[PDB]
Each structure stands twice: as structure tokens, then as C-alpha cells.
Amino acid sequence: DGLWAALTEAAASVEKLLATLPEHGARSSAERAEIAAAHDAARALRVRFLDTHADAVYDRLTDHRRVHLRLAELVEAAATAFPGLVPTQQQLAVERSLPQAAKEGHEIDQGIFLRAVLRSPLAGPHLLDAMLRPTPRALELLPEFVRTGEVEMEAVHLERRDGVARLTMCRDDRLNAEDGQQVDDMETAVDLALLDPGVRVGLLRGGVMSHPRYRGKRVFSAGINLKYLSQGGISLVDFLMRRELGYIHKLVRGVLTNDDRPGWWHSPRIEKPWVAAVDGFAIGGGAQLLLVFDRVLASSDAYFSLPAAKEGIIPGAANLRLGRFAGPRVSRQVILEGRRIWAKEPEARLLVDEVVEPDELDAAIERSLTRLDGDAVLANRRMLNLADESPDGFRAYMAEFALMQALRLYGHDVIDKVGRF
Amino acid sequence: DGLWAALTEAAASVEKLLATLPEHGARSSAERAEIAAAHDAARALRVRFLDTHADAVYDRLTDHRRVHLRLAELVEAAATAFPGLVPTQQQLAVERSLPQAAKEGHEIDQGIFLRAVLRSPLAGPHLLDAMLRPTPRALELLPEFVRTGEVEMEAVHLERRDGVARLTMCRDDRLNAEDGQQVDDMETAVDLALLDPGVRVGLLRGGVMSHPRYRGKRVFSAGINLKYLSQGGISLVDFLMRRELGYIHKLVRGVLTNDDRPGWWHSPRIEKPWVAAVDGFAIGGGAQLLLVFDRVLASSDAYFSLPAAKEGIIPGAANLRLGRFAGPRVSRQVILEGRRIWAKEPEARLLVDEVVEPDELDAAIERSLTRLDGDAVLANRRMLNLADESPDGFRAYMAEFALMQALRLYGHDVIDKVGRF
Amino acid sequence: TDGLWAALTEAAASVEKLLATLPEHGARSSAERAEIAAAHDAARALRVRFLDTHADAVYDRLTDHRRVHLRLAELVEAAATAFPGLVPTQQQLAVERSLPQAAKEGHEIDQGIFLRAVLRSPLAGPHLLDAMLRPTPRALELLPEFVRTGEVEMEAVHLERRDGVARLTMCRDDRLNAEDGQQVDDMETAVDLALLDPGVRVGLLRGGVMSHPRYRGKRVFSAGINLKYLSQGGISLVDFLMRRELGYIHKLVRGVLTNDDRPGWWHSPRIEKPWVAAVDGFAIGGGAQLLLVFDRVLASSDAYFSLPAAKEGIIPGAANLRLGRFAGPRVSRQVILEGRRIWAKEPEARLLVDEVVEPDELDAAIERSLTRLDGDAVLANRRMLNLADESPDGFRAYMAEFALMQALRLYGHDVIDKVGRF
Amino acid sequence: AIGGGAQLLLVFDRVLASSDAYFSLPAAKEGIIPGAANLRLGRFAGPRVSRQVILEGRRIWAKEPEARLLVDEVVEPDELDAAIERSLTRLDGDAVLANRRMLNLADESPDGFRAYMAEFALMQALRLYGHDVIDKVGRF
């Protein structure tokens, strides 16, 4: 067909130019234009190659869809089996060692790949199932958790108490600003909550902060770590896609288990209901999380925003979910124009179920946790979630997002805004 | 293959254990666990069998999709052609004779079956079309109804007047509590209204009650008959699925007719607009109905609830439809937490078009009926319904519902709640 | 092949024989009326059956197995010649166009049957929708002058590039911007220019100053479809009602499909931009429909929004598709099924309108809104939003049924009567 | 709460209602003056709603937004007993006494009350013997 050979050729011109030209930021305009054109030809061919060959490629890596691979494993195995399609671990380590501004944008190739995989009605669902399986880290910590009711992680403190999995986001120095480690901890904690049979409901809440401007106050989330993003430490795959397809999707659909229990034939996934309590504010990735909870409580003084309207990245799946909560006018006000929404305004009730004075909040949270216990809730939330968000809807969106977001992650406007934080 | 034989084997172990063990409630724990494990193995194999063979099975029963069979006929024919897949009429009669608490849960097998059928892009739409055809009972009563303008049925009084089919729900002793007979009446009445060419618009309204606590007052619906549900008299197929796929779906999409009139090529279905008027309250199945009308009126004092949040069954297709009316937050408040919504609160306007004082209501209902007459309305409501609810969306949901609801119908929590009413 | 083409050919001939022999439309007896109605019905039925099985093969003949993009007007013309009797010839249409709606035989209905069948196909459907997203020849031809001058005057639309904004002013000053086939052509042409012009970052749609005595000196957004023309037989199913939905309006949403002629085409085959609408006076019918696709909407304090023809009108475009998502099913029915008019100042205006402003504050609020929508973040976000809000299948499935439902309403007796009284 | 009972609500420090309740002064066409509602209602609801209620017999439901003009808390029948108990514990101190005395003094002057009751004494007497009233009342 010619496409693999043409791609291999275009990738080689890219490697030849990168080997011979000066470092990024010492390049002339002619040189900058030449490498940009080379990248463009190669990426174009990655797309065309995968438009026709994605299923065959995915079948090679997963043994015709009989081995579930998570994202990180999938893209690594794709790199070794299809050199030049997506970057090697080594090529990525060079990239990770640079600040965003200096990067070549190899992650974009991973966006191209994941787009093509998720677009497939065969490969797509299969990858999404892989990401709903429990993480190894969670399987390994599960017995100690069952025994102790407690796990301390770098970014999340998890405690079982009165049948509730209490996730406290506890990055006290930086307003629960998100990074790759927080995602790993979140997923790990979400997996433990779901697998633990002494947990009936989940609670997500921000912990007490220690930074001087917030000392002694709880804060839910200030969204993505902008410093790290500037410094090159936000991974397309291991942060931006992982969170969407992993813990966040697990909140919605539960964890896919193996056929190892009664009832698996009607409930292959273990799902539970989730309550979020918002102190201070929920910004960006933290606001995005609220679109997935069964119940949402907020302090009277809180606000909700997706602020990077002019020069930001796409706010995860908020573009997918927000409209269903707020309609297309408010969804655009919030996302396209950065409208911030306060707990006490009427439109907060589009996102938040209960708004309560700081001194009444603990007790309201506790009451809300008792209301979500039974099997009726489980069945009903499953049916509700199925109606709200079809698997195809989610998959289609995440397919385009994988590439759209990859591009935004390397947009000059973003790199500039982020560097000023 | 191997699956039909393995299923046949697992069903025989079930029949041997049922024949040899004591009656339900005289069984020991060891015996209870043994029969549960047998049921589980068999039901698992029903699922696996149908995952691969559902289309071939359905093709056998319907002559490769050239005979439309309704649900009751389809499951009966499946039982005789595929012994052990779904229960026989005989096995069901034994079940129906028992109270819910004592049943083996054979209807669950029917849930497995219907799930698999509705999941199929070929079988699914076909079965849905069969259930949109007119009922024989309605074809038989149609000429008398055209002549007389009047039919009295056990649970529903139907009257043609001024171009309006007035359905009055008239179970005056029990607040229009629903059962299998009511569904048969409702579908029959809906069929007549649609087929009768002197009917332009429908009206659904609760009749005057006679129970002492409501004497002389109209009441719309108190939802499912909980006594009958406890006593074993609520049929998964003939009540819970029949109403969703029959009269309720006919309110939305109309009756599928044979090619026997002009214009059939553009309008194979005869659809008309429907007005609902709510007196007293609409609970459960009655509240569910409101999500399908073109216009909804309520008395100032009325409320709307889907109350069985802790230990109830799934409220029909409310989990499918409610979100589009109220968004995800309110939809969860109503269904997950049992929030009841009053006619006079602002959020009633999400469900109700007009709220009127009891003494102004009759006249407001009459005016609403005159506003829905033309051909412009027919065309517009068709286009609106098509956008609001896709055929795939409906089908996918009813597929999962079929099994999810079957399981809830036999859940210990439900059986207990229902026994206390 | 399987008998359907022949049976259709036969039913079309009985139609022609009856039309050639019976008296003209308003001179027919009841027996005659009923005979020709029955003949039309048999033929139309067979058009549907024929296309239920053969639509892909038909569409493949006309487009060389989906390798040539044809727009609606070309597609239906080419179908008429390659499949006589399936859809009307240019000649048969000219006879129809020369009659008032009341006297027409309803040949456009056959085009509705055709387009329904095409759009229902998962292969032909998307391919036709892509054809309609391509830039119009008229726009490609005007593009260099537009890039040079920043200005184009058309019959129904004035277009001006200024401070990075494509300012579309609808300027049918004698008629409250009442819509017709020429307005659509102008609108699509202007939308195409705005999208293709690299010095345009954002669009603005606004009604111009009116000259009719009841509105002299006042801006008006839209009074919707030209009812006089509709009565007189001059509103085309294909060239007006489908063209606007699949062309400019869809381009406001999805952008213009270009050829592979620039960097980044592999991620962005379509050039899309954000759009602002500003509503003065009122937005009625087709004008109100347009508001369901803008990124920002501003209205004057005294404006209202309506889709008024609830009793005896045609379908209001894709409002039945889109309105529910904005207002929910109750309000959407109140507006469409019962003709509820919505005022800029009522709370429920906020379902449709982002900002409501006093007439003397409005120009400046429009200018501020245009500066807020500039970047690449907005482009990426609006794309992801539009993709979530309206799936390509959803849009297609709806437009498929609309093509026929609307064709029927275009020839409904009720409509023809209401329209004749205007 | 109807008539004289509705009138009483205009004098309490706290008012709770069940979700299903309503408030009316119904005898708009052929009734007597509803006590001091004509004096007090305007301060709670303004002159437009006050006339809607008294001149035209508009009935006001617990769950409608305007109920908040007359009622502090609206609660579901099963939550009501406990909400009543909590409201009682919030009104205990000496701060409350002092504040309610000052609030009452500002809301209704002794002259205002007295002037109104003076006209009411005769206006109501006349209504108590009006032919329209005697006819309505005889039909009940």
C-alpha cells in the first residue's frame, strides 16, 4: 500500500534534521520552518497510515484483543513494534528533560495513535475496558487496606470509616494542584475503594492546607500544576489521558474485574456512589471532577471555574459533560469565556446539590453519605449513567480529545501563559 | 460451541435440586447456598449462550424476522423451542402461585433473554416494532368504539369527545395503583385512540376516587401495586416490560400499522399528541408517564415523586428520560434520594407546563386540547421526539433494563420493603 | 433487477398520463382529484421502496463511488437525468415554479424522498454532508477581492472585515430581513469568505438598519421566511430549506471543508471560527433558529425570540433538533408546539441569550464580546463542545427525516392557506 | 392557614410550614375585613401582592417563592416536627427579647396600630351586617 514505507521515510528525514540542526531556541527561522515542515509531513502520514491500519496495528499489540493493555504499556509496545509511529521511551526521556517551550512535540504522535485506536469500534472499547481494570498498585495494597482501613499516599490520604471510603486530597503546600503522581494516587485510591467490600460509598474532599495564604483552611483543587506543565513534567498519556480513562471513568463505570465472583454475568464492574465536598474552590481539573459525582456539596464561600479560556488547554471532559449540566449557553460562558460560578448564585444548583455554611458542612456531608447506601442506588445510578453518557459518546469524544489536547499541550499560547505563572 | 449442552446440563442440575430439596423457607443454609450456586451457573450460561447465539435463536422464533411476535408470545415460543433457556408457562404458573419471597426467580432468565434480544441491532428493532403494532384486543373493539365513542374497561374509561380521546384512569379504591390488567387496558385504550380517525388529540387523567381518605377527589397515580408485587402478581414481562415497550412507547412513536392506507410510505406509524392532567399526585409509574406527554398540566396541590430510593425497583424509563428534563443533578436528587417535587415550586416547570388552581383546571385542560390539533403539531412533535430520544438510545437502555429490573424484582431489600406496605 | 425500478417507471407514467389528460389544478372534479392523488401516492411509495434497497447504488452512480463531491442542486439534477421518474427534471420544476403553491403537483416531495434516502445511508449521508461543507464557487471567486478590499456588498448581506472580525450585516431593509433563496446564497457566500479569509478571527451576524415606515431607523435581526414568496411558489425545498441547513448553518457549526492544501490539514480538515450574533428588534422563525448555533448571543432589552407558526406552519428547520438541548423538552414544546414567544428580559431568555443589554449599551457590548473569542484555546474548545452537543449521526439522522417531513409540510393544505392570507 | 389563622402568622417571630400547606384570605368578594391583615400584610408582601391576596383572594402555597414573604421555613411533613424543635432552641436568650422588641416597635408604631383599629372598629361592624356577607355566610 506504500504508507508504512512513506512514514518510515518521513520519520527518517525528521531524525536527520534533529541530529544535524542546532538545539531548539538556537535555530534560525529557515531552520525552524524546515523542521516544522518535516514534522508536519510525518504526522500527516501517521494519520493516513492509521486511518487504514489502526485495527491491524492494535491487533498485533494485544494479540487480537485478548490481552488488555493500559495506555502506558500500549504506547511503549507500539513504539518498539512500529518504529517511528510513536516515540520510544528514550526519545520521551529526552523530551521530559526539556521545558515545554523547547520540546519537539513527540507526544503529538501518541495523540495521533490514541485517536486512531479509540476511533475504532473494535479497538476503542477494548482499550477503555483495559483502563477500567484495577491497577497493580491497588491489587498489591488491597490486603493491608482491608486490614488497616488506611493508606497514606503522597497526594491522597485514604481511610475507610463507617462504610465510606474517605479520599482526602492532601497536597497542603500547593492547593491540591494536580500532577502525574496525584493521578496515580487517585486511581489507586479509587480502585481500593471499589474493591474493598467494607466500602459502600465514596467521599472526595480537599484536606487542610498549610501554605500561608490558606493556613488551616480546606481547599478542593486549584487544577493542573502549571509550574510542572511549563517545566515539561505534564504527560499527555500518563496524566491527561490516564485520568480521563482511568479513575474518572471508574467513578462513573466502576472497575472491571475478572470472572471471580457470583453475579459477574450481570455486573462485570464493581461500581459505587460518590460524594464530593468542595471547600474553598474547585478550579480546572478539580471542577471537571464534579461532573461525575452522585452528590456534590459545597461551602457557601466556594466557587467553581474552568479559567483558561484565552490560552489554556482543553478542560478534560468538561466539554463533553458540562452541557448536559448547564446547557450550551452557560457551558460556553464557563469554558469559552472563563465565567466563574459562585456557590451561592442560583446557577450553582446546576453543578452542586447542597450549599451549606462552613460550620454546618461536616454534618451535611455525613448525612449525605448515609443516603446513598443501598442496592437500589447502585442499580439506579448505573441506569442513569448509561442514559447520560453512552459508551460511544464517551469514546468518540476521547478519540478527538487525544489529538486535540496533544496539540494544545504544545501550542505557543499555552506555553507562554504557563511560563508566567 | 458446547454452550447449549452446558446450559442444558446446568438447567438439569437446577431441576434435580428443586425436585429433591425442601420448599423455599424450609431450606437450610447449606441447601440455600447450593441452589443459589446452581441458579448462578445456569444463568451465567444463559448469558454466554445468548452472547453468541441470540440472533440465530430470534431468527428461529420469528422466521428470520418476518413474523412480528410481542413479548409474551416471544418468550413462550422461546421456552418451547429452547427448553431451559427461559421458563415454560407451567414453570411460571408455579412461580405466580407463590409470594415473591418464596420464588426461585425464573423471570430473571426472561430478563437475560430479552436483554440479549434487545442488544441485537437486528432483533432489537424488530421486537420493538412488534410491540408498536396494535393489540388484537384493540382491533376487536375498534368498530364498536368508532360507533359508540365509548369503552368501559376494568382500569380505564375511554371516551371520544370533541376530537379528543379522554382516557380516565378509574381504579377508585386504590389511587390508580398499577397492575397487569391496567397495562392491558391502557395499551388497548391508547391503541383505540390512535386508530380512531375521529380522534385528533389524547388526554390522560385520573378519575374521581372512592376510598375514604380521597372520596370525591381526583387522583392521577400512586404507582405500582405494592401489595400485588409482594404477593407475586407483578410480571416482569407482562407488566414491567410490556408497559415500556407498548403503550408508553406508543405515546411517543405511535402505532405501527400495515401498509393499508395512503401516506404509509412517509408515516408507517400513526402518532398523535397527548395531554396529561395531574390531580393529587403522580407517584412512581404515574410520574414516569409524564416524561412522554406533549403537554402536562397539574393542580396547584399536586406533587411528583419516584419515592423508592432506598429499597425500590428501577422507576421504568425515568432513568433514561428524566435527565433531559431536569439535568443530572436534579435527576439524581429525585431518583437516587427520593426528592419529591411540588407543583408550585420553580423546578416543577421542568416537568409541568401549567400549574393551575383546582377550580380553574377543567377549563385549562379544555383550552390545552384545542391548541394541539393540526398537522403542524404532528410533524413538529415527530421531529422533536426523534431528536429527544434516538431509537438506539431507547433500545440500549431497555436492553440493560430488562435484566437490571429482573434482578431488582427479586432483590431481598425490595421484597422486604414491599411486604411492609 | 428485483422489479422496483420497473414498477416505479410504470407508476410515474400513469402520473404523466393523468396530468396530460385531466384538467388543470383548480378545474378538477373530486373523482379526478382523488385519482391523481392516488397516482402520486403509488409513485411516491415506490420511490421510497426503490431507494430503501438501491439508494447507495444510485448515489454511487452519480458521484463515481463517492469520489466526486456534489452539492444538493447538482445531485438532484444529475439524479433526474440518470434516473428518469425518480426525481423531477429541471423542466418539470420550472413548470412547478411558475405556479403558486396551491396549484402545484408537489414534485419537490420526490426530492424529499431522494434526500431522505441518501442522508439515511451511513456511506452516502456523510459524503453529501461533506460536499455541502465545501466552499461555494461564488465564494472562491470573490475571495481575492475580499482579502484585498475587506468588503463585499451583496443583495441581502453586507460583509466587512474590520479589526479581525467578519461583520455580516443582513440588509433587506424593506422587509425585516425576510428570507429567500438569494439570502441563503449570500449568507453561505459571506460565511465561506469569513472562514477562508486569514485576516478574520471571529464572525459577527447582525441585522441592519431598516427602511420600511413601521421600522424606519431601527435595526431588525430577522422576520423569518418570506411568506409572500412561499405562497407564490418561490421557496425551494432544496435551494432554500435544505441548502441553508446543510450549508451555511452547518458551516457556522463545523467550518468549511478544504482541500489538503495547508499545514495541519491532517488534524483540521475544516476551518472553523467562533461566531457572535446580536439581536435587535426580534428574531423570528429562521432567524431564531440561527441563534442555536452561535458561540455568543447578545440581544437588545426590547427584543423577543419566536418560532410562531405552531398551528399551520412548516417545521422550523433544525430548531426541533437543537432547541431541547438549550431549553429542555417542556419549553421547547411550548415554543414550537404552542408558539410561545420569549422576551429578552424574561429569565428564560438566558436559555438562548448570553447578554441582554439596553439599546444604548449594545454596540459597545457587542465590541467587547468580539475581543473575548480570539485565541486557539477557543477554537479547540468550541470544536470539542460542538462535537459533544451534536453528533454527526444525530445531525444526519434528523436532516434525513426532515428532508421528507418538511417537503410534505411545504405542500400541506393548512400551510398553503395560512401563507396565502399573509 | 385560612382567614383569621392566616392573619395570625403576621405576628410571629418564626413561621414554619409543611410543604403541602397554603395560606389564604379568601373572602374577597363578599367577606368581612380580615382583621389586621390589611394593616400588616403590606409590610410583608408589598402593596401588589397584598392586594392580590386580599382584594382578589389569591391563595399562596408553601412551595411557591412568594411563600417566603410569610414563611421562614418550608419542610416536608416527615421533617417538620424536628425542624419545629430546632427553631424553638434558636430563640431563647435575652438578645432575642431585646431585638424583637426593637423590631416590633419599628415595624408597627402604637399610633399606626391604634389609628387602624379605630377605623376597623366601625368598618368591620358595618361589614358584619352587610347584605352580601349575610348571603355568602348563609350558604356555607
Ligand SMILES: CC(C)(COP(=O)(O)OP(=O)(O)OC[C@H]1O[C@@H](n2cnc3c(N)ncnc32)[C@H](O)[C@@H]1OP(=O)(O)O)[C@@H](O)C(=O)NCCC(=O)NCCNC(=O)Cc1cc(O)cc(O)c1
Ligand atoms: C487558586 C488561586 C486563585 C489561589 O490564589 P492565592 O489565594 O493568591 O494563592 P497562591 O499563593 O497563588 O496559591 C498558593 C500556592 O499554591 C500554588 N498553586 C496555586 N495554584 C496552582 C496551580 N494551578 N499549579 C501549581 N501551583 C499552584 C502556588 O504555588 C502558590 O504558592 P507557592 O506554592 O508559594 O508558589 C491561584 O493560585 C490561581 O489562580 N492559580 C492558577 C489557576 C489556574 O489556571 N489553574 C489551572 C486551570 N487548568 C487546569 O486545571 C487544566 C486541566 C487539568 C486537568 O487535570 C485535565 C485537563 O484536561 C486540563
Ligand SMILES: CC(C)(COP(=O)(O)OP(=O)(O)OC[C@H]1O[C@@H](n2cnc3c(N)ncnc32)[C@H](O)[C@@H]1OP(=O)(O)O)[C@@H](O)C(=O)NCCC(=O)NCCNC(=O)Cc1cc(O)cc(O)c1
Ligand atoms: C399515595 C399515598 C402517599 C397517600 O397516602 P394515604 O392518603 O395515607 O393513603 P393510603 O390509605 O395508604 O392509600 C389509599 C388507598 O390506596 C391504596 N394504595 C395507594 N397506593 C397503593 C399502591 N401503590 N399499591 C397498593 N395499594 C395502594 C392504600 O392501600 C389504600 O387502600 P386500603 O389498603 O384498601 O385502604 C400513599 O398511599 C402511598 O404511600 N402509596 C404508595 C406510593 C409508592 O411507593 N408507589 C410505588 C412507587 N413505585 C413504583 O411506581 C414502581 C414502578 C412502577 C412502574 O409502573 C414501573 C417501574 O419500572 C417501577
Ligand SMILES: CC(C)(COP(=O)(O)OP(=O)(O)OC[C@H]1O[C@@H](n2cnc3c(N)ncnc32)[C@H](O)[C@@H]1OP(=O)(O)O)[C@@H](O)C(=O)NCCC(=O)NCCNC(=O)Cc1cc(O)cc(O)c1
Ligand atoms: C414580524 C412582524 C410580527 C412585525 O411586522 P409589523 O411590525 O406588524 O409590520 P409589517 O407591515 O407586518 O412588516 C413590515 C414589512 O416587511 C414585510 N414582511 C414582514 N415579515 C415578512 C416575511 N416573513 N416575509 C415577507 N415580507 C415580510 C411586510 O409584509 C411589510 O412589508 P410591505 O408589506 O412591503 O409593507 C410581521 O411582519 C409578521 O407577522 N411577520 C410574519 C412572521 C412569520 O410568520 N415569520 C416566518 C415564520 N416561519 C418561518 O420562518 C419558517 C422557516 C424559515 C426558515 O428559514 C427555515 C425553516 O425550515 C422554516
